[PDB]
Design a protein around this nucleic acid. Structure first.
Lengths: 150, 218, 206
RNA sequence: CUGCAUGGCUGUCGUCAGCUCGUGUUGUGAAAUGUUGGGUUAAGUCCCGCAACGAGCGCAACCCUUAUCCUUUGUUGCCAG
């Protein structure tokens, strides 16, 4: 039950020379559904091809997480080009919730029980890389305690 | 090894600060490497090369410098290595995600030349298209069965194979080099004493290192 | 615009002609009306035959028919003598002895008349139109070609409106006069729409 | 009456030189790099060198034709031997 998820679509229109041209960009995620996350950028002259390039990069990208029991133990921040994504462990209700570009990212990591906001740039290609910087930043307790001698 | 005590090569007063610990003195007025340490320095790196080959790491030999421009396959035909002898440029290894199209194009010939469909005319394929395959075997045949990027790189001279060192240091590939009297280990991760301009010597030296890559089939 | 009539004005360019006939100009309209009549009774004994096109030549005191088929067995029938029915349906209309030639189609999944049939018979079975359209192109472009375009119209994928969507691979020179384009329009004619497909195939100039 | 409902028919920059597919490398990215530099051309044209390569399209080539021999014709045309 591995699932390949889309975050956002963008269209960039440029006057040439005489007349105009336009291309589309997509941002997708695949990961592993538990403890591993991965994302891809894709750009083409049509939406289905931009998504197809993005999936072909997202299956060839990976990040390992310090994850246990599908959940967070501490608040964490991650930053990329003005996106300052801050994450809190969410309990006793709905698990998603959170910013519109984060909902698939948490679910392909297996951590879709988290309240997250962007606190800056809302641009999805900054937001995803600030959310993933937070999944890279988090650690186990376990390791934050195991830094002690013996 | 020195056997009858004979010593040859380049440089009779000059040597670089990075070679300072290898040279012991001079013989036949040429600077000589310490004969007590040559064999264990050579064996040290040759065992790591055998271990890379024993975990299915593929070994790429660069023979652009004249003393190996044929010997890299003519003195190594039963060693299970891959080879390059053409002049290097930017992208000469780092562009592999594109250059794989030429590998796909080579396999499309050697999957057709074996069939009787290729033989039924006098020259249209059985001469004109064998001349097309034998042309691409010359420039890419020495890497056609490798795939992706190398797991170790070997060079005859770090002064002349310097762009193969550059492209390997861009991909993260460990580099093995031969040294004698003037060498810079910047971008090189293993060094061994040997020959770089012999007429002679290099043919036997290539068999003394590359045969440990076919031991990786064990 | 700039779609033109490929089966009309473009069909006489870099291609062999499908009819050749002489008549007195005082009866030209009646001999043009019979050029259709000698097809009307014939394309009903080819109804299963996967024919890409037919050619009907009317020399003096003669009529000569060529059939370009993907299935040469189904036009010759039991013991291979049932091909004479293709003469007898036109000789009974023209009132002169008729000749028949059966010609083989090279790569029947690269011929525009037959590719549009192989898409229409999938749309009648309610398959996802993009799957049939993309498989028709990935098949044809691997059999040969320099480029191909497909355009599907009517009730696309379960849509509440008629619509039109297309897909193209390689080059399709529609504004070039010497391009030798192979074309067809087909229609499925259902209780719930007309459901149409149009295909343009390019394989080489002249 | 109206291209201010269309299709077809063509008109134009213009024989202008430039436009894409599979790709590499660089940047968060618009996009860049290459297609820049040295020589040159009818021309992103042909070369030299280089972080770029293959494959296509247009150009050129291809197709049409003219300036003059050779062989074939040989008349009620031509006429040298």
């Amino acid at each position: 039950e591995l699932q390949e998820k889309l975050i956002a679509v963008n269209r960039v229109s440029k006057t040439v020379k005489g007349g105009r041209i336009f291309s589309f960009t997509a941002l997708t995620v695949v990961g592993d559904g538990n403890g591993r996350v991965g994302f891809g950028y894709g750009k083409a002259r049509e939406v289905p091809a931009a998504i197809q390039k993005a999936m072909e990069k997202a299956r060839r990208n990976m990040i390992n997480v310090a994850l246990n029991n599908g959940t967070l133990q501490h608040p964490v921040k991650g930053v990329h080009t003005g996106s300052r994504v801050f994450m809190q462990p969410a309990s006793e209700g709905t698990g998603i919730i959170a910013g519109g570009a984060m909902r698939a990212v948490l679910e392909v990591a297996g951590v879709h029980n988290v309240l997250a906001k962007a606190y800056g740039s809302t641009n999805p290609i900054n937001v995803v890389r600030a959310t993933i910087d937070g999944l890279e930043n988090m650690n186990s307790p376990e390791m934050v305690a195991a830094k002690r001698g013996k | 090894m020195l056997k009858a005590g004979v010593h040859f090569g380049h440089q009779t007063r000059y040597w670089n600060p990075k070679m300072k610990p290898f040279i012991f003195g001079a013989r036949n007025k040429v600077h000589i490497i310490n004969l007590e340490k040559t064999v264990p320095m050579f064996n040290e790196a040759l065992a790591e090369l055998n271990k890379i080959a024993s975990r299915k790491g593929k070994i790429l030999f660069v023979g652009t410098k004249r003393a190996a421009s044929e010997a890299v396959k003519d003195a190594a035909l039963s060693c299970d290595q891959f080879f390059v002898n053409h002049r290097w440029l930017g992208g000469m290894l780092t562009n592999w995600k594109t250059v794989r199209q030429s590998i796909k194009r080579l396999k499309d010939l050697e999957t057709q030349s074996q069939d009787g469909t290729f033989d039924k005319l006098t020259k249209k394929e059985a001469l004109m298209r064998t001349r097309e395959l034998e042309k691409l075997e010359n420039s890419l045949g020495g890497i056609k069965d490798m795939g992706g990027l190398p797991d170790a790189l070997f060079v005859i001279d770090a002064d002349h194979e310097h762009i193969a060192i550059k492209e390997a240091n861009n991909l993260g590939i460990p580099v093995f080099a031969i040294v004698d009297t003037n060498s810079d280990p910047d971008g090189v991760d293993f060094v061994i004493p040997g020959n770089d301009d012999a007429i002679r010597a290099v043919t036997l030296y290539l068999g003394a290192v590359a045969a440990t890559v076919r031991e990786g089939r064990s | 615009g700039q779609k033109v009539h490929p089966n009309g004005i473009r069909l006489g360019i870099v291609k062999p002609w499908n009819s050749t006939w002489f008549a007195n100009t005082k009866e030209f309209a009646d001999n043009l009306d019979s050029d259709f009549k000698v097809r009307q009774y014939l394309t009903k004994e080819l109804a299963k035959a996967s024919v890409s096109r037919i050619v009907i030549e009317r020399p003096a005191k003669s009529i000569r028919v060529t059939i370009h088929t993907a299935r040469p067995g189904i036009v010759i029938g039991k013991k291979g003598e049932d091909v004479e029915k293709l003469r007898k349906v036109v000789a009974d209309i023209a009132g002169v002895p008729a000749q028949i030639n059966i010609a083989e189609v090279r790569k029947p999944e690269l011929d525009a008349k037959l590719v549009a049939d192989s898409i229409t018979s999938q749309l009648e079975r309610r398959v996802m139109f993009r799957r049939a359209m993309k498989r028709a192109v990935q098949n044809a472009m691997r059999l040969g070609a320099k480029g191909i375009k497909v355009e599907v119209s009517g009730r696309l994928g379960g849509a509440e409106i008629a619509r039109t969507e297309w897909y193209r691979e390689g080059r399709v020179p529609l504004h070039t006069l010497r391009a030798d384009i192979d074309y067809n329009t087909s229609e499925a004619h259902t209780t719930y729409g007309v459901i149409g497909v149009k295909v343009w195939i390019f394989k080489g100039e002249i």
